[PDB]
Amino acid sequence: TLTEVKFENAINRVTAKANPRQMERVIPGSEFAFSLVYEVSFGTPDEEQKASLPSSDEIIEDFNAIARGLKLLELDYLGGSGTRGYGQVKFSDLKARAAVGTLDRSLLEMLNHELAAV
RNA sequence: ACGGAAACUUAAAACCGUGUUGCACUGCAACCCGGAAUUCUUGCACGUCG
């Protein structure tokens, strides 16, 4: 059926009366693909620092921000019905890939080193 | 029988022919459909044997 009807209940301690609730979730094995693109991020600045191209050292900071972005996200939620247990996810098979660009060989394999640190 | 009396300033001819209101321009940048609710409280596998 691809989507459960997971129930719930309310109990008010004035009278212990039952009030139901239904929280339809995803199936807990539903795997999704997951893509995102980074870039060499060449600045279009309002600020006076005109044509400030990020080099690899500014790039390699961001993969830790990719790491600690999703490392806590695996630990934390995604969805609603907050703080009752829904949405423990596990990001798997993370890989960066120079789709288009002139990235050097040494860099990209070290950019995946942050991706396994989660 | 007045230097008198008669007479068109008249006939035709195109202000026409060549010519783009055209070329450069992201309806774009930022935001979680997110927060708090017990599937619960009453309930014995048993009456029945000349």
Say which residue the tokens 């950019």 belong to. A111
Give the Å distances, CA to CA, from A25 to A10, A72, A82: 19, 21, 13
Q: Which two tokens stand for residue A104?
A: 């050097």
- Coil vs helix vs strand at A106: helix
* Tokens of residue A61, six digits: 């900071």
Question: How far: A88 CA to B11 C1' (Å)?
Answer: 108
Å between A74 CA and B2 C1'? 135
Tell me if A64 sits within 8 A of A112, measured CB to CB. Answer: no
A81, burial (CB in 10 Å: exposed 0-12, middle 13-18, buried 19+): middle
- Protein CA A58 to sugar C1' B1 (Å): 132
- The set of residues with CB closer than 7 Å to nucleic strand B is A 7-11, 16-21, 77-84
The residue type found at A106 is S
Alpha helices in A22-85 (DSSP H): 56-75
Q: What's the CA gap between A97 and A61, in Å, rounded?
A: 17
Record the tokens describing residue A58, joined without a space.
């500014």
